[PDB]
Amino acid sequence: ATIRYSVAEEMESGSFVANVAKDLGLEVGKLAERGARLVAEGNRLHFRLHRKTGDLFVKEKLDREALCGKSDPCVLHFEIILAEPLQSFRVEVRVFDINDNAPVFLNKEPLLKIPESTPLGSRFPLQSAQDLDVGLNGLQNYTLSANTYFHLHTRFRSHGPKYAELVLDNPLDREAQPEVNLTITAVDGGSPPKSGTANIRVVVLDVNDHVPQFSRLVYRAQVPENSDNGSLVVVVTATDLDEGTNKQITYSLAENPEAVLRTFLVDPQTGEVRLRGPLDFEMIETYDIDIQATDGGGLSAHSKVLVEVVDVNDHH
Numbered sequence: 001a002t003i004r005y006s007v008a009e010e011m012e013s014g015s016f017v018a019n020v021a022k023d024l025g026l027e028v029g030k031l032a033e034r035g036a037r038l039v040a041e042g043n044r045l046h047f048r049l050h051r052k053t054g055d056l057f058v059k060e061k062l063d064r065e066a067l068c069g070k071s072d073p074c075v076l077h078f079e080i081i082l083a084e085p086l087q088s089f090r091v092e093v094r095v096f097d098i099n100d101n102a103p104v105f106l107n108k109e110p111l112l113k114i115p116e117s118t119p120l121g122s123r124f125p126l127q128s129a130q131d132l133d134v135g136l137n138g139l140q141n142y143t144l145s146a147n148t149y150f151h152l153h154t155r156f157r158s159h160g161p162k163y164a165e166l167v168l169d170n171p172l173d174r175e176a177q178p179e180v181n182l183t184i185t186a187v188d189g190g191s192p193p194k195s196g197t198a199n200i201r202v203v204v205l206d207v208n209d210h211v212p213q214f215s216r217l218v219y220r221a222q223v224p225e226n227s228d229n230g231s232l233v234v235v236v237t238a239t240d241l242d243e244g245t246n247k248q249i250t251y252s253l254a255e256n257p258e259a260v261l262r263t264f265l266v267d268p269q270t271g272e273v274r275l276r277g278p279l280d281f282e283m284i285e286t287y288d289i290d291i292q293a294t295d296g297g298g299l300s301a302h303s304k305v306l307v308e309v310v311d312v313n314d315h316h
Ligand SMILES: *[C@@H]1O[C@H](CO[C@@H]2O[C@@H](C)[C@@H](O)[C@@H](O)[C@@H]2O)[C@@H](O[C@@H]2O[C@H](CO)[C@@H](O[C@@H]3O[C@H](CO)[C@@H](O)[C@H](O)[C@@H]3O)[C@H](O)[C@H]2NC(C)=O)[C@H](O)[C@H]1NC(C)=O
Pocket: 140, 141, 142, 143
């Protein structure tokens, strides 16, 4: 009823396809004589017939991804018309698929920002790739680069892979490495398989999971009673391994006896523990002051400075 042939994709134009006279029920001379003409719909003119030889050539480089797109059978139809007697013959040439397209990502550099306090076992979806081929020549599998935090889990469908997702195996600690960088690899199933890699940048968001720590737990100080107002008792420092607003330190005098808050002050920024009142050895020999370093998130830490006034009042 209908005659068909098979051709390979992306072969050079003018290349041979088949010989018509054989499977037409005629001979070459008959083809030349009966006026063998190729006719199809106006839009498609993919082939060419040489009458005198009965030879079928392809007129253009056939690109299957353009003609059929994502369709499994790529078939081109056209009819051979004759004359005396006037016969019409339906011909269909199938364009086989080859592996001339590798998988690719639209974002070669995706940006995935994961908070530091992320529960172990959490999953992060990744955008799939695009292999324009069909079947085994299309997408088949994903792989993840060597890593100490993640492992890749590829959600599959019946025909092909749905998409891939990162699964966290280890607790993310920003203080260790604030960023982890990876390369996802998309692999088809052709022979040889073709690959397409993308580069994921995983940024770890700082969480206030670090209380400020004072240098010394106890600050020893020996201050002369005849010292002036605003004289520097001591300088205290507090460190925070975090970043952002969860790092800046706010020093403060809190929960102290009246005398302390009456004769002492502290600089909220620098840590300048200084005087705001007079001193007399006979009245108060020693002060013990608990200062408080407060973090932006609210994590506070205490430390006591033990001041001891020196020299009898007006001894020298
Ligand atoms: C999709 O691909 C994954 C992993 O990728 C494949 O396996 C690698 C080892 C390489 O050979 C890649 O070229 C290849 O694409 C497949 O899952 C994995 O299959 C392998 C089969 O050998 C399993 O072997 C393991 O090997 C390690 C050490 O090499 C051992 O510690 C394991 O105990 C085990 O023997 C592996 O467990 C398995 N999973 C992972 C995460 O690698 C997957 O089968 C494939 N799917 C399809 C449909 O192709």
